[PDB]
């Protein structure tokens, strides 16, 4: 199948330079184009360029003439998006896309890559429990999460119980405190049956700080 | 460059009806080769963007025929019949007829669905946050419709100002519905002060207010 995987989320200071991959499979590489496309945060999606990995020929929207340059890896099925002298404006999650001409559209996109550009330093979470509202001998639900607390900058990863729970999760969006960390709360609801016969462990992934924790929640 | 212009800005919509979503352009997309280069993509909360139209009024592969384009020229439409829960997000069109493509600004679809009433959770801080110096006490309103809800903080039956922070998640893509976190932030010296932390909800699906409470060290 189809499939075009990025890199990791970045934390970068101003002035940096900045380069995110995008590795293609599932298809013939050099048959198709590879456009990278921003999305600044709780913006529209804008169009930065494509680059041929036929000819080699890179093409910039109006925007994204200068310090944009897109590099390719042929053997390695990999395209590239590098960002000279970074700004504040720079502050987006990039997406690469595969370009199909033969109706000139995009068709499979990435997962996409966070950039931060900021003079401030990581700061790995604190993932703290959220201990399950009932016992075991009570009915119906029981709640209960983790509170992955002051962290900089966006994003972490969370999931229970490595991925295999998924069902009645709810991931809050990140709010900022008066210290300018960020915070979050993961919660899951579940049969309060299970409280005494299932453990619950949430994994938390704050890759610009290297930070993975798994926490334990129990009653 | 030519600009696209779509409108609404934001489409609520009942599960079952009819949504459409329009697609301006100030120059005409139709290419001197007789093509019109106008596409839809669909970026679902939290996701990439997914190509759901091309060239006006093919469905991509897997995208269900409830999806159909139309227009030519200038304006082109998407419309969505019986509308279902998963369609929810922010709806894109693309031109590639002119250089350099561009997207119109999206049209966030949200559903309209019956009122749903929140079930309230509290959560005390954790040893292990109190023995690194602060306390969070955390309400969770899991599952409500519609988002607006008024949470109130009460610490030994004292309304709290100023000291929580909330969050939403985006409506669920299966039932559409919302859920909310309040957070109260204390030192362990504050917290310790007091006894009775609770957290008071009021909502339309509420006949009166829903509180729930903890003694700490209970």
């Known amino acids: 199948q189809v499939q075009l995987v990025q890199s990791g989320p970045e934390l970068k200071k101003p002035g940096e330079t900045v380069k995110i991959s995008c590795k293609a499979s599932?298809?013939?590489?050099?048959?198709?184009?590879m456009n990278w496309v921003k999305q600044a945060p709780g913006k529209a999606l804008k169009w930065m360029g494509w680059?041929?990995?036929?000819?080699?020929?890179?093409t910039f929207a109006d925007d994204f003439k200068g310090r944009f340059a897109f590099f390719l890896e042929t053997s390695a099925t990999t395209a590239y998006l590098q960002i000279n002298n970074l700004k504040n404006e720079d502050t987006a999650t990039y997406f690469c896309?595969?370009?199909?001409?033969?109706?000139?559209?995009?068709?499979?996109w990435g997962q996409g890559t966070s950039v931060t550009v900021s003079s401030a330093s990581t700061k790995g979470p604190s993932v703290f429990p959220l201990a399950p509202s009932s016992k075991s001998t009570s009915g119906g639900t029981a709640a209960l999460g983790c509170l992955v607390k002051d962290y900089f900058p966006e994003p972490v990863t969370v999931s229970w119980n490595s991925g295999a729970l998924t069902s009645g999760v709810h991931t809050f969006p990140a709010v900022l405190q008066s210290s300018g960390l960020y915070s979050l709360s993961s919660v899951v609801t579940v049969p309060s049956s299970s409280l005494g016969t299932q453990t619950y462990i949430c994994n938390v992934n704050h890759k610009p700080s290297n930070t993975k924790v798994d926490k334990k929640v129990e009653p | 460059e030519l600009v696209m212009t779509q409108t609404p800005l934001s489409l609520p919509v009942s599960l079952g009806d009819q949504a459409s979503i329009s697609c301006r352009s100030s120059?005409?997309?139709?290419?001197?080769?007789?093509?019109?280069?106008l596409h839809w993509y669909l970026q679902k909360p939290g996701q990439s963007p997914k190509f759901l139209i091309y060239?006006?009024?093919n469905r991509f592969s897997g995208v269900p025929d409830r999806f159909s384009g139309s227009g030519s020229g200038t304006d082109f439409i998407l419309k969505i019949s019986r509308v279902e829960a998963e369609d929810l997000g922010v709806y894109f069109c693309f031109q590639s007829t002119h250089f350099f493509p561009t997207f119109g600004g999206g049209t966030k679809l949200e559903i309209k669905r019956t009122v749903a009433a929140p079930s309230v959770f509290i959560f005390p801080p954790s040893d292990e946050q109190l023995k690194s110096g602060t306390a969070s006490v955390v309400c969770l309103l899991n599952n409500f419709y519609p988002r607006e809800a008024k949470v109130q903080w009460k610490v030994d039956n004292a309304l709290q100002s100023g000291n929580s922070q909330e969050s939403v998640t985006e409506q669920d893509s299966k039932d559409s519905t919302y859920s909310l976190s309040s957070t109260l932030t204390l030192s362990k010296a504050d917290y310790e002060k007091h006894k009775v932390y609770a957290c008071e909800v009021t909502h339309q699906g509420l006949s009166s207010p829903v509180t729930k409470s903890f003694n700490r060290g209970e």
């Open positions: 599932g298809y013939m590489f050099t048959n198709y184009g």
């Open positions: 680059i041929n990995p036929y000819t080699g020929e890179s």
């Open positions: 120059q005409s997309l139709v290419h001197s080769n007789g093509n019109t280069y």
């Open positions: 060239k006006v009024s």
């Open positions: 896309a595969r370009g199909t001409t033969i109706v000139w559209a995009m068709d499979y």
